[PDB]
């Protein structure tokens, strides 16, 4: 057996407590004035509330409080301009609150559950089963073809933003099989020369991006219109509107562009 | 999420491989994964979900307990890797369904989606998809040597590499650095991703790395580890078996210490 990480249990907040406060409910958190709350606990009417410590940021605790405020409840995407490591802790808070909420009852036997005192787990009052937060591994892949890169627009958001291909890994498959399968299903092409670049959590709602680069091998772009509005090869020096700087998708595109410059220029 | 072909009742003229799973075990009569006609295995009338295809013949999940030869999927690890991966998927999907008979949000009974591997609630709008546990595993190199450690979990005699679950809101790279520090007290450098593998014990996705020693002295976490030490690539102790990603990373780290020295 491999064990999950040990963590401090929740407790009642006092006046002397302080830090960043991720006050969350149903995939949202409190952003008073569009900002992540920071300061002493009385400043935010949180003294007497239960809070879970979910991290530390530059000497200061990061706290999860499970409550819904009347106003200024938003997506964590609103504080994406924050330092990455802080943003990652705010996402952690949002996800942990959904974990707890998703586990009020035990799915094995239907009885009420209660938090573990030593780890981020839900224990059952009736049976021996338990659950840990669900992270959904997700591949994302920049596909290079000579001096070009495959960029797509999703049929969902008419943003005008052309990005790479992404999709959830399925049970029983490797990352490399997920890459190959998602690309096929989304665009009809077979890829080769897969290369892992990096990973990033992505709390929308609970993904872990595993980022790859790959080369065109064979096939015609045949897009699934339910997933994709369009997909085309764009030359490295002639790109459309891309994902923001900071996103793993922009990082992959830039990497691909950089090695087209090193070969064809 | 990905769409899938729905479940259905097996007929006499149904065939393929059968993952007949209940409570984390599957049916392995005489130690073998059932292949052939449904009727040979008294499987007609049962529900099945096709979980894949192996060499032009379907792989089916049947959720049922047999009297004999219920065993761990580890017992079929000798099979081709892609057949082992599908047997593990069946085991994992049976445990997913079992783990979601009731909804965790509202407590009402759930029912399977027909358009994907999901459980939907009879009362509320909430949903669950199968849980996959990203787990890092790292072979640490230091010059002509590799870090191997014995685990407290089972007195195996086996010396293997370091592994741990990725936490919520951390990268694979951060997970590697933290686990190695927590378990062995050392800082590593030049992290390289090698590969991944599903590992259905119960539901892990191994992401395999190689790393180099940077600093620190070996100080073990005595709850997780019995002992840890550096080992010459020409003088290795007992290792995990050659059907594991652990053995692959050790062989890879040993293959390039053979080169340089
Ligand atoms: Zn229970
Ligand atoms: Zn429900």
Short mmCIF file of C-alpha atoms and ligand atoms in Angstrom, two decimals:
data_model
loop_
_atom_site.label_atom_id
_atom_site.label_comp_id
_atom_site.label_asym_id
_atom_site.label_seq_id
_atom_site.Cartn_x
_atom_site.Cartn_y
_atom_site.Cartn_z
CA UNK A 1 0.00 0.00 0.00
CA UNK A 2 0.97 3.63 -0.63
CA UNK A 3 -0.30 6.20 1.89
CA UNK A 4 -1.83 9.58 1.36
CA UNK A 5 -0.16 12.69 2.78
CA UNK A 6 -0.83 13.56 6.40
CA UNK A 7 -2.39 16.97 7.05
CA UNK A 8 -3.66 19.03 9.96
CA UNK A 9 -7.36 18.67 10.75
CA UNK A 10 -9.73 21.63 10.66
CA UNK A 11 -10.32 23.86 13.66
CA UNK A 12 -12.21 26.85 14.95
CA UNK A 13 -10.77 30.22 13.77
CA UNK A 14 -9.62 32.75 16.38
CA UNK A 15 -8.90 36.50 16.28
CA UNK A 16 -5.11 36.00 16.18
CA UNK A 17 -5.45 33.87 13.03
CA UNK A 18 -4.47 35.43 9.72
CA UNK A 19 -3.53 34.58 6.16
CA UNK A 20 -5.24 34.09 2.84
CA UNK A 21 -8.83 32.98 3.13
CA UNK A 22 -10.39 30.82 0.46
CA UNK A 23 -14.03 31.00 1.40
CA UNK A 24 -15.69 28.59 -1.00
CA UNK A 25 -18.94 26.95 -1.96
CA UNK A 26 -20.04 25.11 -5.15
CA UNK A 27 -17.02 25.85 -7.40
CA UNK A 28 -16.88 29.49 -6.34
CA UNK A 29 -14.99 31.55 -3.77
CA UNK A 30 -15.27 34.94 -2.12
CA UNK A 31 -13.46 37.76 -3.97
CA UNK A 32 -14.40 41.02 -2.17
CA UNK A 33 -13.48 43.87 -4.57
CA UNK A 34 -12.37 41.20 -7.08
CA UNK A 35 -9.56 40.10 -4.73
CA UNK A 36 -8.60 37.05 -2.66
CA UNK A 37 -9.21 37.96 1.02
CA UNK A 38 -6.05 38.67 3.01
CA UNK A 39 -5.69 39.81 6.62
CA UNK A 40 -6.76 38.94 10.16
CA UNK A 41 -9.85 36.76 10.69
CA UNK A 42 -12.03 39.49 12.26
CA UNK A 43 -11.55 41.70 9.20
CA UNK A 44 -13.60 39.09 7.30
CA UNK A 45 -16.16 38.14 9.99
CA UNK A 46 -14.60 34.62 10.18
CA UNK A 47 -13.84 34.31 13.91
CA UNK A 48 -15.68 31.28 15.34
CA UNK A 49 -15.89 29.65 11.89
CA UNK A 50 -14.26 26.31 11.11
CA UNK A 51 -11.34 26.51 8.71
CA UNK A 52 -8.94 24.00 7.20
CA UNK A 53 -5.33 24.92 6.54
CA UNK A 54 -4.49 24.04 2.95
CA UNK A 55 -1.06 25.62 2.61
CA UNK A 56 1.28 28.53 3.20
CA UNK A 57 2.20 31.39 0.92
CA UNK A 58 5.26 33.48 1.62
CA UNK A 59 5.04 32.97 5.39
CA UNK A 60 1.27 33.19 5.67
CA UNK A 61 -1.30 30.42 6.15
CA UNK A 62 -3.81 29.71 3.41
CA UNK A 63 -7.15 28.77 4.89
CA UNK A 64 -10.24 27.00 3.52
CA UNK A 65 -13.59 28.19 4.90
CA UNK A 66 -16.66 26.38 3.59
CA UNK A 67 -19.31 29.04 3.36
CA UNK A 68 -21.24 31.00 0.74
CA UNK A 69 -21.21 34.81 1.12
CA UNK A 70 -24.03 37.01 -0.11
CA UNK A 71 -21.90 38.76 -2.72
CA UNK A 72 -18.69 38.60 -4.72
CA UNK A 73 -18.80 34.83 -5.25
CA UNK A 74 -16.85 34.08 -8.43
CA UNK A 75 -14.63 31.76 -10.40
CA UNK A 76 -11.02 31.28 -9.32
CA UNK A 77 -10.21 32.26 -12.94
CA UNK A 78 -10.75 35.86 -11.69
CA UNK A 79 -7.53 35.70 -9.57
CA UNK A 80 -5.38 33.94 -12.24
CA UNK A 81 -3.09 37.04 -12.36
CA UNK A 82 -1.82 36.03 -8.89
CA UNK A 83 1.55 34.32 -8.41
CA UNK A 84 1.17 30.77 -9.78
CA UNK A 85 1.87 29.09 -6.45
CA UNK A 86 -0.80 31.17 -4.71
CA UNK A 87 -3.31 30.62 -7.52
CA UNK A 88 -2.60 26.85 -7.15
CA UNK A 89 -3.52 27.08 -3.42
CA UNK A 90 -6.75 28.96 -4.19
CA UNK A 91 -7.64 26.19 -6.66
CA UNK A 92 -6.76 23.62 -3.95
CA UNK A 93 -9.31 25.32 -1.63
CA UNK A 94 -12.08 25.35 -4.24
CA UNK A 95 -11.50 21.63 -5.05
CA UNK A 96 -11.32 20.54 -1.37
CA UNK A 97 -14.67 22.18 -0.62
CA UNK A 98 -16.21 20.26 -3.55
CA UNK A 99 -14.56 17.07 -2.33
CA UNK A 100 -16.23 17.47 1.10
CA UNK A 101 -19.53 18.44 -0.47
CA UNK A 102 -19.44 15.49 -2.89
CA UNK A 103 -18.91 13.14 0.09
CA UNK A 104 -21.62 14.04 2.61
CA UNK A 105 -22.88 10.48 2.13
CA UNK A 106 -20.92 7.33 1.51
CA UNK A 107 -21.48 6.04 -2.01
CA UNK A 108 -20.83 2.47 -0.91
CA UNK A 109 -23.42 2.25 1.88
CA UNK A 110 -25.21 5.63 1.87
CA UNK A 111 -24.42 6.57 5.48
CA UNK A 112 -23.10 9.96 6.52
CA UNK A 113 -19.38 10.58 6.29
CA UNK A 114 -16.99 12.60 8.42
CA UNK A 115 -13.56 14.07 7.77
CA UNK A 116 -10.39 12.23 8.68
CA UNK A 117 -8.37 13.89 11.44
CA UNK A 118 -4.96 13.07 9.92
CA UNK A 119 -5.41 13.40 6.12
CA UNK A 120 -7.62 14.99 3.43
CA UNK A 121 -9.98 12.02 3.35
CA UNK A 122 -13.63 11.29 4.01
CA UNK A 123 -14.28 8.40 6.42
CA UNK A 124 -17.59 6.63 6.84
CA UNK A 125 -19.60 6.31 10.03
CA UNK A 126 -21.01 2.85 9.03
CA UNK A 127 -18.57 0.99 6.73
CA UNK A 128 -14.73 0.93 6.36
CA UNK A 129 -14.53 2.67 3.00
CA UNK A 130 -13.09 6.09 2.35
CA UNK A 131 -12.44 8.64 -0.38
CA UNK A 132 -9.66 11.13 -1.25
CA UNK A 133 -9.89 14.24 -3.48
CA UNK A 134 -10.39 13.40 -7.15
CA UNK A 135 -7.83 14.75 -9.57
CA UNK A 136 -8.62 14.21 -13.25
CA UNK A 137 -5.47 13.68 -15.35
CA UNK A 138 -5.79 15.46 -18.64
CA UNK A 139 -3.49 15.45 -21.66
CA UNK A 140 -2.78 18.57 -23.70
CA UNK A 141 -0.76 18.44 -26.91
CA UNK A 142 0.84 20.84 -29.42
CA UNK A 143 1.10 19.04 -32.81
CA UNK A 144 3.89 20.19 -35.11
CA UNK A 145 4.02 19.55 -38.85
CA UNK A 146 7.21 20.83 -40.46
CA UNK A 147 6.88 24.66 -40.24
CA UNK A 148 3.28 24.51 -38.99
CA UNK A 149 1.29 23.89 -35.82
CA UNK A 150 -2.30 22.55 -35.45
CA UNK A 151 -4.53 25.06 -33.67
CA UNK A 152 -8.24 24.66 -33.04
CA UNK A 153 -11.22 26.69 -31.92
CA UNK A 154 -13.77 24.99 -29.65
CA UNK A 155 -17.41 25.10 -30.76
CA UNK A 156 -18.42 25.98 -27.20
CA UNK A 157 -16.80 29.42 -26.79
CA UNK A 158 -16.75 31.75 -29.81
CA UNK A 159 -13.78 33.51 -28.20
CA UNK A 160 -11.69 33.84 -31.38
CA UNK A 161 -8.90 31.98 -29.50
CA UNK A 162 -7.08 29.16 -31.26
CA UNK A 163 -5.44 26.65 -28.94
CA UNK A 164 -4.04 23.11 -28.78
CA UNK A 165 -5.85 19.82 -28.27
CA UNK A 166 -6.76 18.56 -24.76
CA UNK A 167 -8.75 15.74 -23.18
CA UNK A 168 -9.25 13.57 -20.12
CA UNK A 169 -7.28 10.35 -19.65
CA UNK A 170 -9.52 7.27 -19.28
CA UNK A 171 -9.23 4.50 -16.74
CA UNK A 172 -6.73 1.84 -17.86
CA UNK A 173 -4.77 3.99 -20.29
CA UNK A 174 -1.35 5.57 -20.28
CA UNK A 175 -0.74 9.27 -20.95
CA UNK A 176 0.74 8.47 -24.37
CA UNK A 177 -2.33 6.40 -25.36
CA UNK A 178 -4.60 9.25 -24.19
CA UNK A 179 -2.68 11.69 -26.38
CA UNK A 180 -2.95 9.44 -29.44
CA UNK A 181 -6.63 8.70 -28.82
CA UNK A 182 -7.80 12.28 -28.15
CA UNK A 183 -5.97 13.60 -31.21
CA UNK A 184 -7.59 10.97 -33.42
CA UNK A 185 -11.09 11.50 -32.05
CA UNK A 186 -10.76 15.27 -32.25
CA UNK A 187 -8.85 15.77 -35.53
CA UNK A 188 -8.42 12.40 -37.34
CA UNK A 189 -4.62 12.59 -37.44
CA UNK A 190 -2.01 10.14 -36.19
CA UNK A 191 0.89 11.72 -34.31
CA UNK A 192 4.41 10.54 -33.47
CA UNK A 193 7.54 11.52 -31.48
CA UNK A 194 5.66 12.31 -28.27
CA UNK A 195 7.54 14.42 -25.72
CA UNK A 196 6.38 15.39 -22.24
CA UNK A 197 7.03 19.06 -21.40
CA UNK A 198 5.38 19.83 -18.07
CA UNK A 199 2.30 19.60 -15.87
CA UNK A 200 -0.10 22.12 -14.30
CA UNK A 201 -3.11 21.76 -12.03
CA UNK A 202 -6.18 23.30 -13.53
CA UNK A 203 -9.06 23.73 -11.08
CA UNK A 204 -11.79 23.78 -13.73
CA UNK A 205 -13.03 21.79 -11.81
CA UNK A 206 -10.19 19.36 -10.91
CA UNK A 207 -7.85 18.58 -13.82
CA UNK A 208 -4.15 17.88 -13.89
CA UNK A 209 -2.75 18.93 -17.27
CA UNK A 210 0.05 16.75 -18.60
CA UNK A 211 1.51 18.72 -21.55
CA UNK A 212 3.11 17.04 -24.56
CA UNK A 213 4.50 17.93 -27.94
CA UNK A 214 4.06 15.64 -30.89
CA UNK A 215 4.69 15.49 -34.61
CA UNK A 216 2.33 14.89 -37.49
CA UNK A 217 2.60 11.31 -38.79
CA UNK A 218 -0.42 10.73 -41.07
CA UNK A 219 -4.08 11.58 -41.78
CA UNK A 220 -6.54 14.27 -42.90
CA UNK A 221 -7.90 16.89 -40.51
CA UNK A 222 -11.41 15.58 -39.90
CA UNK A 223 -12.88 17.55 -36.99
CA UNK A 224 -15.65 16.38 -34.68
CA UNK A 225 -18.04 19.36 -34.93
CA UNK A 226 -19.43 18.73 -31.38
CA UNK A 227 -15.93 19.30 -29.93
CA UNK A 228 -14.44 21.66 -32.56
CA UNK A 229 -15.53 24.68 -34.64
CA UNK A 230 -12.36 24.47 -36.74
CA UNK A 231 -8.82 23.14 -36.73
CA UNK A 232 -5.98 24.20 -39.12
CA UNK A 233 -2.22 24.22 -39.64
CA UNK A 234 -0.76 27.68 -39.01
CA UNK A 235 2.79 28.55 -39.95
CA UNK A 236 5.09 29.24 -37.00
CA UNK A 237 5.65 32.90 -38.01
CA UNK A 238 1.97 33.60 -38.77
CA UNK A 239 -0.12 32.69 -35.72
CA UNK A 240 -3.69 33.70 -34.85
CA UNK A 241 -5.03 34.74 -31.43
CA UNK A 242 -3.56 32.37 -28.84
CA UNK A 243 -4.16 31.46 -25.16
CA UNK A 244 -2.86 33.95 -22.54
CA UNK A 245 0.79 34.02 -21.35
CA UNK A 246 0.86 31.80 -18.25
CA UNK A 247 -1.26 28.99 -19.70
CA UNK A 248 0.38 25.63 -20.40
CA UNK A 249 -1.18 25.83 -23.91
CA UNK A 250 0.67 29.09 -24.71
CA UNK A 251 3.89 27.55 -23.29
CA UNK A 252 3.54 24.54 -25.64
CA UNK A 253 2.82 26.72 -28.68
CA UNK A 254 5.84 28.95 -27.92
CA UNK A 255 8.06 25.88 -27.51
CA UNK A 256 6.88 24.55 -30.88
CA UNK A 257 7.43 27.92 -32.57
CA UNK A 258 10.94 28.11 -31.08
CA UNK A 259 12.11 24.86 -32.67
CA UNK A 260 10.61 25.77 -36.03
CA UNK A 261 12.83 28.91 -35.86
CA UNK A 262 15.84 26.75 -34.95
CA UNK A 263 15.24 24.44 -37.98
CA UNK A 264 13.82 26.67 -40.77
CA UNK A 265 15.64 29.87 -39.79
CA UNK B 1 -15.96 13.48 -21.22
CA UNK B 2 -15.58 10.54 -23.63
CA UNK B 3 -18.66 8.69 -24.87
CA UNK B 4 -18.84 4.88 -24.56
CA UNK B 5 -21.00 1.97 -25.86
CA UNK B 6 -23.63 1.14 -23.16
CA UNK B 7 -24.08 -2.09 -21.23
CA UNK B 8 -26.26 -4.93 -22.38
CA UNK B 9 -27.42 -8.49 -21.72
CA UNK B 10 -25.06 -11.23 -22.92
CA UNK B 11 -26.36 -13.73 -25.51
CA UNK B 12 -25.24 -17.30 -26.33
CA UNK B 13 -23.37 -16.13 -29.43
CA UNK B 14 -21.35 -13.54 -27.50
CA UNK B 15 -17.60 -13.93 -27.28
CA UNK B 16 -14.35 -12.25 -26.34
CA UNK B 17 -12.51 -11.88 -23.05
CA UNK B 18 -14.41 -11.78 -19.75
CA UNK B 19 -13.45 -9.63 -16.75
CA UNK B 20 -15.87 -10.95 -14.15
CA UNK B 21 -15.18 -8.69 -11.20
CA UNK B 22 -16.52 -8.18 -7.73
CA UNK B 23 -14.87 -6.41 -4.77
CA UNK B 24 -11.48 -5.79 -6.37
CA UNK B 25 -10.99 -9.39 -7.56
CA UNK B 26 -11.71 -10.99 -10.91
CA UNK B 27 -12.46 -14.52 -12.09
CA UNK B 28 -9.35 -16.43 -13.10
CA UNK B 29 -10.33 -20.10 -13.52
CA UNK B 30 -7.13 -22.20 -13.28
CA UNK B 31 -5.24 -18.87 -13.05
CA UNK B 32 -6.28 -17.69 -16.51
CA UNK B 33 -8.35 -14.74 -17.75
CA UNK B 34 -11.54 -16.22 -19.31
CA UNK B 35 -11.61 -16.30 -23.11
CA UNK B 36 -14.27 -17.81 -25.42
CA UNK B 37 -18.04 -18.10 -25.84
CA UNK B 38 -20.38 -16.63 -23.21
CA UNK B 39 -22.15 -20.00 -22.93
CA UNK B 40 -18.95 -21.86 -21.96
CA UNK B 41 -18.84 -19.65 -18.82
CA UNK B 42 -22.61 -19.79 -18.02
CA UNK B 43 -22.60 -16.04 -18.75
CA UNK B 44 -25.77 -15.81 -20.91
CA UNK B 45 -28.43 -13.41 -19.55
CA UNK B 46 -25.90 -11.45 -17.47
CA UNK B 47 -25.28 -7.75 -18.13
CA UNK B 48 -22.01 -6.79 -19.76
CA UNK B 49 -20.23 -3.55 -20.66
CA UNK B 50 -17.62 -3.76 -23.41
CA UNK B 51 -14.52 -2.13 -21.97
CA UNK B 52 -12.31 -2.52 -25.02
CA UNK B 53 -10.86 -4.77 -27.68
CA UNK B 54 -7.84 -7.05 -27.65
CA UNK B 55 -6.61 -8.34 -30.99
CA UNK B 56 -10.02 -8.19 -32.70
CA UNK B 57 -12.04 -9.76 -29.86
CA UNK B 58 -14.02 -7.70 -27.30
CA UNK B 59 -13.17 -7.31 -23.64
CA UNK B 60 -16.30 -7.39 -21.45
CA UNK B 61 -16.89 -6.33 -17.85
CA UNK B 62 -19.37 -8.51 -15.98
CA UNK B 63 -20.10 -7.52 -12.40
CA UNK B 64 -20.58 -10.82 -10.61
CA UNK B 65 -19.04 -12.99 -7.86
CA UNK B 66 -18.04 -16.62 -8.64
CA UNK B 67 -17.60 -19.35 -5.98
CA UNK B 68 -13.97 -20.14 -6.93
CA UNK B 69 -10.86 -18.55 -8.42
CA UNK B 70 -11.66 -14.93 -7.50
CA UNK B 71 -8.18 -13.36 -7.48
CA UNK B 72 -6.19 -10.16 -7.77
CA UNK B 73 -5.48 -8.79 -11.26
CA UNK B 74 -1.77 -9.00 -10.28
CA UNK B 75 -2.10 -12.74 -11.08
CA UNK B 76 -2.56 -11.89 -14.80
CA UNK B 77 0.39 -9.45 -14.95
CA UNK B 78 2.25 -12.00 -17.18
CA UNK B 79 -0.22 -11.18 -19.99
CA UNK B 80 0.59 -8.76 -22.82
CA UNK B 81 0.67 -5.23 -21.34
CA UNK B 82 -2.41 -4.03 -23.24
CA UNK B 83 -4.46 -7.04 -22.10
CA UNK B 84 -3.33 -6.43 -18.51
CA UNK B 85 -4.38 -2.74 -18.89
CA UNK B 86 -7.93 -3.74 -20.01
CA UNK B 87 -8.31 -6.33 -17.19
CA UNK B 88 -7.33 -3.60 -14.74
CA UNK B 89 -9.86 -1.21 -16.30
CA UNK B 90 -12.62 -3.75 -15.70
CA UNK B 91 -11.59 -4.28 -12.11
CA UNK B 92 -11.39 -0.49 -11.68
CA UNK B 93 -14.76 0.16 -13.31
CA UNK B 94 -16.49 -2.47 -11.13
CA UNK B 95 -15.10 -0.71 -8.02
CA UNK B 96 -16.13 2.70 -9.42
CA UNK B 97 -19.75 1.50 -9.79
CA UNK B 98 -19.66 -0.18 -6.36
CA UNK B 99 -18.29 2.99 -4.76
CA UNK B 100 -21.27 5.04 -6.14
CA UNK B 101 -24.40 3.03 -5.40
CA UNK B 102 -25.49 6.09 -3.44
CA UNK B 103 -24.87 9.72 -4.24
CA UNK B 104 -22.38 11.45 -1.93
CA UNK B 105 -24.05 14.85 -2.34
CA UNK B 106 -27.64 13.93 -1.36
CA UNK B 107 -27.62 10.24 -0.38
CA UNK B 108 -30.01 8.90 -3.02
CA UNK B 109 -29.32 5.93 -5.28
CA UNK B 110 -27.38 6.41 -8.49
CA UNK B 111 -27.62 4.76 -11.88
CA UNK B 112 -25.10 4.29 -14.69
CA UNK B 113 -24.97 6.65 -17.69
CA UNK B 114 -25.48 4.95 -21.08
CA UNK B 115 -23.41 7.54 -23.00
CA UNK B 116 -20.28 7.36 -20.85
CA UNK B 117 -18.66 5.64 -17.86
CA UNK B 118 -20.47 7.72 -15.21
CA UNK B 119 -22.91 7.46 -12.30
CA UNK B 120 -25.88 9.86 -12.36
CA UNK B 121 -28.17 10.59 -9.41
CA UNK B 122 -31.87 9.67 -9.26
CA UNK B 123 -32.54 12.77 -7.09
CA UNK B 124 -29.96 15.58 -7.69
CA UNK B 125 -28.05 16.76 -10.82
CA UNK B 126 -24.64 15.62 -9.69
CA UNK B 127 -22.32 13.11 -11.32
CA UNK B 128 -19.15 11.09 -10.75
CA UNK B 129 -16.60 9.73 -13.17
CA UNK B 130 -14.03 7.06 -12.33
CA UNK B 131 -11.23 8.21 -9.99
CA UNK B 132 -7.64 7.96 -11.22
CA UNK B 133 -4.86 8.62 -8.67
CA UNK B 134 -1.77 10.25 -10.20
CA UNK B 135 1.27 8.77 -8.45
CA UNK B 136 4.90 9.82 -9.08
CA UNK B 137 7.75 7.27 -9.11
CA UNK B 138 11.36 8.38 -9.30
CA UNK B 139 14.75 6.70 -9.73
CA UNK B 140 17.41 8.95 -8.24
CA UNK B 141 20.94 8.77 -9.65
CA UNK B 142 24.15 10.00 -8.07
CA UNK B 143 27.21 9.33 -10.18
CA UNK B 144 27.81 5.55 -10.46
CA UNK B 145 24.87 4.72 -8.17
CA UNK B 146 21.10 4.60 -7.63
CA UNK B 147 18.95 5.32 -4.57
CA UNK B 148 16.96 2.26 -3.51
CA UNK B 149 14.90 1.87 -0.35
CA UNK B 150 13.03 -0.88 1.48
CA UNK B 151 9.43 -0.15 2.47
CA UNK B 152 7.87 -0.70 5.89
CA UNK B 153 4.53 -1.64 4.24
CA UNK B 154 5.64 -5.25 3.64
CA UNK B 155 8.86 -7.04 4.58
CA UNK B 156 9.50 -8.00 0.98
CA UNK B 157 13.31 -7.99 0.82
CA UNK B 158 12.87 -5.86 -2.31
CA UNK B 159 14.81 -2.63 -2.84
CA UNK B 160 12.88 -0.22 -5.06
CA UNK B 161 12.45 3.43 -5.94
CA UNK B 162 10.43 6.22 -4.31
CA UNK B 163 6.73 6.70 -5.11
CA UNK B 164 3.90 8.88 -3.82
CA UNK B 165 0.54 10.38 -4.63
CA UNK B 166 0.38 13.77 -6.28
CA UNK B 167 -1.66 16.12 -4.10
CA UNK B 168 -4.45 18.43 -5.09
CA UNK B 169 -3.07 21.64 -6.65
CA UNK B 170 0.49 20.47 -7.25
CA UNK B 171 2.43 19.57 -10.40
CA UNK B 172 4.15 16.23 -11.08
CA UNK B 173 7.49 18.08 -10.65
CA UNK B 174 6.53 19.50 -7.22
CA UNK B 175 5.19 16.09 -6.19
CA UNK B 176 8.56 14.49 -7.10
CA UNK B 177 10.59 17.08 -5.19
CA UNK B 178 8.38 16.89 -2.06
CA UNK B 179 8.08 13.11 -1.84
CA UNK B 180 11.86 12.62 -2.24
CA UNK B 181 12.53 15.29 0.40
CA UNK B 182 9.88 13.94 2.81
CA UNK B 183 10.96 10.29 2.34
CA UNK B 184 14.76 10.52 2.01
CA UNK B 185 15.81 14.06 2.91
CA UNK B 186 17.57 14.81 -0.36
CA UNK B 187 17.27 17.50 -3.06
CA UNK B 188 17.31 16.25 -6.65
CA UNK B 189 17.90 17.92 -10.02
CA UNK B 190 17.34 17.54 -13.77
CA UNK B 191 13.95 15.75 -13.48
CA UNK B 192 13.14 13.79 -16.65
CA UNK B 193 9.74 12.25 -17.41
CA UNK B 194 10.19 8.72 -18.78
CA UNK B 195 6.73 7.10 -19.09
CA UNK B 196 3.37 6.32 -17.43
CA UNK B 197 1.40 3.23 -16.57
CA UNK B 198 -2.01 2.52 -15.09
CA UNK B 199 -1.58 0.53 -11.86
CA UNK B 200 -4.90 -0.86 -10.63
CA UNK B 201 -3.97 -1.28 -6.94
CA UNK B 202 -6.61 0.17 -6.57
CA UNK B 203 -6.55 3.01 -9.13
CA UNK B 204 -3.14 4.65 -9.70
CA UNK B 205 -1.65 6.25 -12.80
CA UNK B 206 2.11 5.95 -12.37
CA UNK B 207 4.09 8.79 -13.95
CA UNK B 208 7.71 7.66 -14.04
CA UNK B 209 10.67 10.03 -13.69
CA UNK B 210 14.43 10.05 -13.49
CA UNK B 211 16.32 12.59 -11.40
CA UNK B 212 19.84 13.44 -10.23
CA UNK B 213 21.23 14.01 -6.75
CA UNK B 214 21.82 17.68 -5.91
CA UNK B 215 22.34 17.83 -2.13
CA UNK B 216 21.47 16.48 1.32
CA UNK B 217 22.21 13.35 3.27
CA UNK B 218 19.86 10.39 3.36
CA UNK B 219 17.49 10.84 6.29
CA UNK B 220 14.50 8.48 6.04
CA UNK B 221 10.86 8.89 7.09
CA UNK B 222 10.66 5.85 9.40
CA UNK B 223 6.89 5.42 8.97
CA UNK B 224 7.23 4.80 5.20
CA UNK B 225 10.81 3.40 4.90
CA UNK B 226 12.84 0.64 6.64
CA UNK B 227 16.17 1.74 5.16
CA UNK B 228 17.49 3.63 2.11
CA UNK B 229 20.94 3.84 0.58
CA UNK B 230 23.00 4.43 -2.58
CA UNK B 231 23.92 1.36 -4.63
CA UNK B 232 26.48 0.80 -7.38
CA UNK B 233 24.92 -0.04 -10.75
CA UNK B 234 27.21 -3.11 -10.87
CA UNK B 235 26.28 -4.21 -7.32
CA UNK B 236 22.49 -4.02 -7.01
CA UNK B 237 20.39 -5.85 -4.35
CA UNK B 238 16.94 -7.49 -4.75
CA UNK B 239 14.73 -5.44 -7.08
CA UNK B 240 11.03 -5.36 -8.04
CA UNK B 241 9.96 -7.79 -10.85
CA UNK B 242 10.44 -7.03 -14.63
CA UNK B 243 6.68 -6.41 -15.14
CA UNK B 244 6.79 -3.18 -13.11
CA UNK B 245 7.63 0.41 -14.02
CA UNK B 246 9.95 0.40 -11.00
CA UNK B 247 12.13 -2.24 -12.57
CA UNK B 248 12.15 -0.29 -15.82
CA UNK B 249 13.43 2.95 -14.15
CA UNK B 250 16.16 1.03 -12.27
CA UNK B 251 17.25 -0.69 -15.52
CA UNK B 252 17.22 2.69 -17.30
CA UNK B 253 19.24 4.38 -14.51
CA UNK B 254 21.58 1.35 -14.40
CA UNK B 255 21.91 1.24 -18.23
CA UNK B 256 23.44 4.78 -18.32
CA UNK B 257 25.72 4.30 -15.28
CA UNK B 258 27.06 1.31 -17.25
CA UNK B 259 27.78 3.73 -20.11
CA UNK B 260 29.59 6.43 -18.15
CA UNK B 261 31.59 3.99 -15.96
ZN1 LIG C 1 -20.11 3.67 4.08
ZN1 LIG C 2 -27.55 13.11 -5.48
#
